[PDB]
Amino acid sequence: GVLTIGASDESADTILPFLLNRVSSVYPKLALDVRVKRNAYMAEMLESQEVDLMVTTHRPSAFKALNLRTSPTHWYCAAEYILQKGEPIPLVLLDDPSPFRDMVLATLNKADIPWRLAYVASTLPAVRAAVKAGLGVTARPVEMMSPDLRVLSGVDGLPPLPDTEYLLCYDPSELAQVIYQAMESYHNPW
Amino acid sequence: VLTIGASDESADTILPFLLNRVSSVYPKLALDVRVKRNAYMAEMLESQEVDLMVTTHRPSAFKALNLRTSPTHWYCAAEYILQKGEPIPLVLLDDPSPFRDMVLATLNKADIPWRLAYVASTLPAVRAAVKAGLGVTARPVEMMSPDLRVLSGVDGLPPLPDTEYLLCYDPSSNNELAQVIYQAMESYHNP
Amino acid sequence: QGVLTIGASDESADTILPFLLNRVSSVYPKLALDVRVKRNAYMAEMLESQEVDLMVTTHRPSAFKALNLRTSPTHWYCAAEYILQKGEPIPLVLLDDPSPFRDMVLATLNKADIPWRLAYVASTLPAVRAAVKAGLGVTARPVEMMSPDLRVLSGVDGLPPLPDTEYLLCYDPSSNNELAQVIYQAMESYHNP
Amino acid sequence: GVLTIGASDESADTILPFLLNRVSSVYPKLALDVRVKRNAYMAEMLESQEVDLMVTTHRPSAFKALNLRTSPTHWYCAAEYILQKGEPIPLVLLDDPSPFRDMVLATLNKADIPWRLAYVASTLPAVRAAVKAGLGVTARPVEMMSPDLRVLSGVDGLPPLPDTEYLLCYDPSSNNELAQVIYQAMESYHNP
């Protein structure tokens, strides 16, 4: 057969290595089409059966969703960046939609923290680069950590964040089913 | 409103350096950084879609300032087993990528048997397959993570050309942002 | 123009000593730098005996001035594909005493009635990280240890939160070393406007 | 019983995750204390039988030595470090002994390149920290590469460097049956 996997850029390089390793070890005859789009497009890709399985950081509402990894989410800035207390937090964000864009704005609002969109771009590479160059502050899971970056946390004025879930998602409505369930009886243990 | 195009490769490696300097010396100026695949960089700078370009493929018709020279290495999974004797299983982009063109030529010019074990459309798809131990690729030395192991001559792979990180400009436009920023980044690498 | 002796613990030598040594050897380009790197516990003794003029540690002293250079979150780590069986005592990878992180991880887990066992005790950090990555157990370290070999354990895995780790530049006020104080006075004027 | 492995500070965290991982899956039956000392002191530890195995990047003369990893060795400096042309190359090195210091000076003499010791340190973390702080140049295996750093190659005028071998080391003239059984386990599992 031909297994098509959809993964967000975010979960593509963090948790797809471990999955894609296991896919090509138990079913070694099977061709692998890994399609990477933004995290927003992942629902439409699984609904329209463009992909057989999905690895996302945004829980869907209509599809069974197995959790592969839960990461703490951190505020990030450049290692030598200066977070100016008093002015709005200068945010470096994706354009609409990334739940993370939606999520970080909600979190700073619920803490009465002014913010600003210092840099909006359409891809993670543009966002990652802008934080590292120190154009402002962003939020991603703990796996984005490089020596380029520093964590901004409560003492710098930034509120706690929800966890990141890296979710394998499957549509109940044959090769999608067996691979999901092979990851599910191999996830807990045994 | 300076629009900078950067290859998927060179986006996080060499654009932090540039994007830092533009938004510090000319801190007023809005930034549209559009990042596409490595091949589309040539087309984008001529068609005036971008003001500037940062790629690892030297163009022939554009000014090209070299921002960094890194060695290119073969990579496989840290725990990968490369079976010497049977064909080199490549993890590559689909056409086009100069890295693909360079890898096949370097394997062809040294008469090494190979195969496409995995052809992908994006770097995140390629990296995942290398790290999962689906085959080998060649990328600049900046991709080295603990997931990966370096293949060198010892394992049967010939040396690879350097990776050049290029800031590129089209002189045939009226773009002051392009020209003065290209000359400004020339005032740092070699004033 | 003198020879500045800086003491750093294994952890804060790697994380923030590049940042420190960069700032020192740009304002005083003539000044020689002797950095002696030991465990985190020997750091208090070293500054009082003026074996070093200044110290960078993650354990706040009781007797010394302390400039805060970075406050990082502290996280539990295990190997990326490690399996934490809920129900068995947590197998810990630790240093022997003394190490602040040990005292914290033991105090942390005791403070919330979670059983543990010493799956691996090591003598040095390179041994500890190697043991965490080998999937021999759990640890707690600042977020700066995070590599792809590893996975972070949080609340959903049954582990309590951790107090932050502070990377502190310290000075002996019971001293006469213009070197220590004036270099100390340089580091807060770049970490704060 | 108790398996004592010595690792260099260098190779302790690079390739010892794999070995100590493999020891504890085939023999979860034995306790193991890994003590990491400087890269030179590894040999004396195995001859004086303080440790049963060694993992080093400096080949010893008296002991069995399994090749576990051959990775390219590179010049490093700070990502934005500025290497002047003719002026002598300012080196960031350990003080004697680290064979790496011996190797950097040996190869820089084979091509007649002027140098100077801009920064000598006591520990690997102090040397790497000075390289990252951008006080000069060092040469370390490709596993040191982080975004802090840039690689110096031929383009900038520094000569080529030899590979690094991460070697599992054992003394055959000592009858540690546990040492050899772990050596052959890493030898029958480094070759499938």
Side-chain angles (χ1 to χ4, degrees), chain B residues 90-104:
Chain B
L90 289 178
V91 177
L92 287 172
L93 281 181
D94 58 359
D95 297 308
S97 64
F99 272 108
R100 166 167 180 123
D101 298 326
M102 187 272 289
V103 156
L104 297 179

mmCIF file of all heavy atoms in Angstrom, chain B residues 90-104:
data_model
loop_
_atom_site.group_PDB
_atom_site.id
_atom_site.type_symbol
_atom_site.label_atom_id
_atom_site.label_comp_id
_atom_site.label_asym_id
_atom_site.label_seq_id
_atom_site.Cartn_x
_atom_site.Cartn_y
_atom_site.Cartn_z
ATOM 1 N N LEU B 90 19.138 6.808 -0.301
ATOM 2 C CA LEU B 90 19.078 8.268 -0.103
ATOM 3 C C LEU B 90 17.713 8.681 0.442
ATOM 4 O O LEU B 90 16.698 8.141 0.014
ATOM 5 C CB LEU B 90 19.389 8.987 -1.415
ATOM 6 C CG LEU B 90 20.833 8.911 -1.886
ATOM 7 C CD1 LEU B 90 20.975 9.616 -3.228
ATOM 8 C CD2 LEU B 90 21.760 9.558 -0.872
ATOM 9 N N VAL B 91 17.749 9.636 1.360
ATOM 10 C CA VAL B 91 16.600 10.449 1.804
ATOM 11 C C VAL B 91 16.824 11.845 1.230
ATOM 12 O O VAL B 91 17.788 12.521 1.630
ATOM 13 C CB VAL B 91 16.501 10.473 3.332
ATOM 14 C CG1 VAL B 91 15.359 11.370 3.790
ATOM 15 C CG2 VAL B 91 16.334 9.071 3.880
ATOM 16 N N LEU B 92 15.962 12.242 0.304
ATOM 17 C CA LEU B 92 16.170 13.458 -0.504
ATOM 18 C C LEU B 92 14.850 14.204 -0.668
ATOM 19 O O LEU B 92 13.784 13.643 -0.427
ATOM 20 C CB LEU B 92 16.719 13.047 -1.875
ATOM 21 C CG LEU B 92 18.164 12.588 -1.923
ATOM 22 C CD1 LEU B 92 18.440 12.039 -3.313
ATOM 23 C CD2 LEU B 92 19.106 13.735 -1.625
ATOM 24 N N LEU B 93 14.962 15.455 -1.089
ATOM 25 C CA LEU B 93 13.815 16.217 -1.613
ATOM 26 C C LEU B 93 13.453 15.661 -2.987
ATOM 27 O O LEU B 93 14.295 14.973 -3.608
ATOM 28 C CB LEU B 93 14.175 17.702 -1.716
ATOM 29 C CG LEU B 93 14.137 18.506 -0.413
ATOM 30 C CD1 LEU B 93 14.502 19.962 -0.665
ATOM 31 C CD2 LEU B 93 12.784 18.432 0.265
ATOM 32 N N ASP B 94 12.239 15.951 -3.447
ATOM 33 C CA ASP B 94 11.872 15.754 -4.867
ATOM 34 C C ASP B 94 12.479 16.905 -5.654
ATOM 35 O O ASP B 94 12.919 17.894 -5.046
ATOM 36 C CB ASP B 94 10.356 15.688 -5.061
ATOM 37 C CG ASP B 94 9.629 16.925 -4.564
ATOM 38 O OD1 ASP B 94 10.314 17.835 -4.051
ATOM 39 O OD2 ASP B 94 8.394 16.982 -4.709
ATOM 40 N N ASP B 95 12.468 16.782 -6.969
ATOM 41 C CA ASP B 95 13.050 17.828 -7.835
ATOM 42 C C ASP B 95 12.166 19.065 -7.734
ATOM 43 O O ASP B 95 10.940 18.966 -7.635
ATOM 44 C CB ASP B 95 13.186 17.339 -9.273
ATOM 45 C CG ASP B 95 14.147 16.163 -9.410
ATOM 46 O OD1 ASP B 95 15.277 16.287 -8.932
ATOM 47 O OD2 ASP B 95 13.750 15.130 -10.004
ATOM 48 N N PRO B 96 12.761 20.274 -7.739
ATOM 49 C CA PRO B 96 14.210 20.437 -7.642
ATOM 50 C C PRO B 96 14.766 20.780 -6.251
ATOM 51 O O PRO B 96 14.125 21.492 -5.497
ATOM 52 C CB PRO B 96 14.429 21.626 -8.580
ATOM 53 C CG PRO B 96 13.211 22.488 -8.369
ATOM 54 C CD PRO B 96 12.079 21.523 -8.110
ATOM 55 N N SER B 97 15.941 20.251 -5.931
ATOM 56 C CA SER B 97 16.802 20.849 -4.886
ATOM 57 C C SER B 97 18.253 20.681 -5.304
ATOM 58 O O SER B 97 18.687 19.576 -5.598
ATOM 59 C CB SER B 97 16.522 20.287 -3.510
ATOM 60 O OG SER B 97 16.826 18.910 -3.425
ATOM 61 N N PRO B 98 19.028 21.777 -5.441
ATOM 62 C CA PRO B 98 20.471 21.701 -5.598
ATOM 63 C C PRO B 98 21.170 20.692 -4.693
ATOM 64 O O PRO B 98 22.144 20.115 -5.164
ATOM 65 C CB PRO B 98 20.938 23.136 -5.267
ATOM 66 C CG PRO B 98 19.670 23.962 -5.075
ATOM 67 C CD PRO B 98 18.584 23.142 -5.732
ATOM 68 N N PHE B 99 20.710 20.484 -3.456
ATOM 69 C CA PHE B 99 21.319 19.438 -2.586
ATOM 70 C C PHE B 99 21.167 18.064 -3.254
ATOM 71 O O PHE B 99 22.120 17.286 -3.283
ATOM 72 C CB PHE B 99 20.743 19.428 -1.168
ATOM 73 C CG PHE B 99 21.467 20.352 -0.226
ATOM 74 C CD1 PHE B 99 20.866 21.521 0.209
ATOM 75 C CD2 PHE B 99 22.737 20.052 0.240
ATOM 76 C CE1 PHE B 99 21.530 22.387 1.066
ATOM 77 C CE2 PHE B 99 23.399 20.913 1.100
ATOM 78 C CZ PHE B 99 22.794 22.079 1.509
ATOM 79 N N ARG B 100 19.978 17.781 -3.773
ATOM 80 C CA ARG B 100 19.707 16.524 -4.506
ATOM 81 C C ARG B 100 20.646 16.429 -5.707
ATOM 82 O O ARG B 100 21.291 15.390 -5.866
ATOM 83 C CB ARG B 100 18.250 16.470 -4.965
ATOM 84 C CG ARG B 100 17.962 15.390 -5.992
ATOM 85 C CD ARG B 100 16.463 15.244 -6.104
ATOM 86 N NE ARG B 100 16.072 14.240 -7.071
ATOM 87 C CZ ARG B 100 15.309 13.193 -6.781
ATOM 88 N NH1 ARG B 100 14.854 12.992 -5.551
ATOM 89 N NH2 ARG B 100 14.991 12.328 -7.729
ATOM 90 N N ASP B 101 20.715 17.486 -6.518
ATOM 91 C CA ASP B 101 21.597 17.540 -7.715
ATOM 92 C C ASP B 101 23.053 17.324 -7.295
ATOM 93 O O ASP B 101 23.777 16.592 -7.991
ATOM 94 C CB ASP B 101 21.440 18.868 -8.463
ATOM 95 C CG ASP B 101 20.038 19.068 -8.999
ATOM 96 O OD1 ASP B 101 19.406 18.053 -9.386
ATOM 97 O OD2 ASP B 101 19.576 20.227 -8.994
ATOM 98 N N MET B 102 23.466 17.927 -6.185
ATOM 99 C CA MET B 102 24.854 17.795 -5.709
ATOM 100 C C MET B 102 25.095 16.373 -5.178
ATOM 101 O O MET B 102 26.180 15.830 -5.429
ATOM 102 C CB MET B 102 25.161 18.854 -4.651
ATOM 103 C CG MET B 102 26.613 18.850 -4.263
ATOM 104 S SD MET B 102 26.841 17.683 -2.916
ATOM 105 C CE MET B 102 26.038 18.590 -1.597
ATOM 106 N N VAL B 103 24.145 15.783 -4.455
ATOM 107 C CA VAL B 103 24.355 14.450 -3.825
ATOM 108 C C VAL B 103 24.492 13.390 -4.908
ATOM 109 O O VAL B 103 25.377 12.534 -4.779
ATOM 110 C CB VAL B 103 23.234 14.066 -2.846
ATOM 111 C CG1 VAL B 103 23.140 12.548 -2.679
ATOM 112 C CG2 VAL B 103 23.438 14.744 -1.505
ATOM 113 N N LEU B 104 23.615 13.415 -5.908
ATOM 114 C CA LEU B 104 23.595 12.373 -6.968
ATOM 115 C C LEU B 104 24.863 12.506 -7.809
ATOM 116 O O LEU B 104 25.518 11.486 -8.047
ATOM 117 C CB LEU B 104 22.335 12.538 -7.821
ATOM 118 C CG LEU B 104 21.035 12.343 -7.059
ATOM 119 C CD1 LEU B 104 19.835 12.540 -7.972
ATOM 120 C CD2 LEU B 104 20.999 10.973 -6.405
#
